[PDB]
Design a protein around this ligand. Structure first.
Ligand SMILES: COc1ccc(O[C@@H]2O[C@H](CO)[C@H](O[C@H]3O[C@H](CO)[C@H](O)[C@H](O)[C@H]3O)[C@H](O)[C@H]2O)cc1
Length: 197
């Protein structure tokens, strides 16, 4: 019987961007950099073997994801609008979604392999991801009615790699956008600024 195992390895690190003194007519800008490191399984869908013992062939399809909010609320209830300025080589998909950007990079497909492998790691299991992907540059638009004062806004987002192992050549699977949208947002960028006059 044909099988497909798909596992999402999630990266999770914290960083900050200090925007300094800002006026509502200006657009602060920050860069989201892909940070190789320890990833945690946060989702899977499997109906195949859990381990490949090196004696039989399977096929690999890997797709990196970044799911980033289009709007983030301040603690006092004002929207900050996140706008993509430079997506690099990323594929920007499902553009009609009102709440989140979906950036994908499918970099391996239809690759036959016999290497021993953990084909269906469980949520909570970890592994090192050494792959590097392109930066994404964002700009922020502040609402003109934003009250003056100090702002600290946590911008949570998801980044990670979907690994799909299959028993057959030509296998394709993309995590549904409605599932990707709700994957845990384990990365955080803390955006600090002061709205002045
Ligand atoms: C055998 O003929 C092929 C024609 C075109 C192909 O396209 C490649 O498919 C890959 C499948 O994993 C991968 O596409 C995935 O990722 C894209 C984002 O980078 C996008 O989301 C696609 O919808 C997704 O399927 C490569 O990027 C394509 O160039 C493969 C074989």
């Amino acid at each position: 019987m044909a099988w497909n195992n798909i596992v999402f390895y999630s990266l999770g690190d914290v960083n900050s961007y200090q925007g300094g003194n800002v006026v509502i007519t200006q657009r602060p800008q920050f860069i989201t950099s892909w940070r190789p490191g320890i990833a945690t399984v946060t989702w899977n869908q499997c109906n195949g073997p859990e381990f490949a013992d090196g004696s039989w062939a399977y096929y690999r399809e890997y797709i990196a994801w970044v799911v980033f909010p289009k709007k983030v609320m301040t603690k006092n209830g004002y929207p900050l609008f996140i706008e993509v300025h430079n997506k690099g080589s990323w594929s920007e998909e499902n553009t009609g979604d009102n709440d989140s950007y979906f950036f994908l990079k499918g970099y391996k497909w239809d690759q036959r392999a016999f290497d021993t492998a953990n084909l269906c790691q469980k949520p909570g299991e970890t592994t090192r991801l050494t792959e590097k992907f392109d930066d994404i540059i964002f700009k922020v638009a502040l609402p003109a009615d934003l009250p003056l004062g100090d702002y600290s806004v946590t911008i949570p987002y998801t980044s990670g790699i979907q690994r799909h192992f299959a028993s057959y050549l030509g296998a394709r699977f993309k995590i549904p956008y409605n599932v990707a949208k709700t994957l845990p947002r384990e990365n955080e960028m803390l955006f600090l600024f002061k709205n002045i006059g």
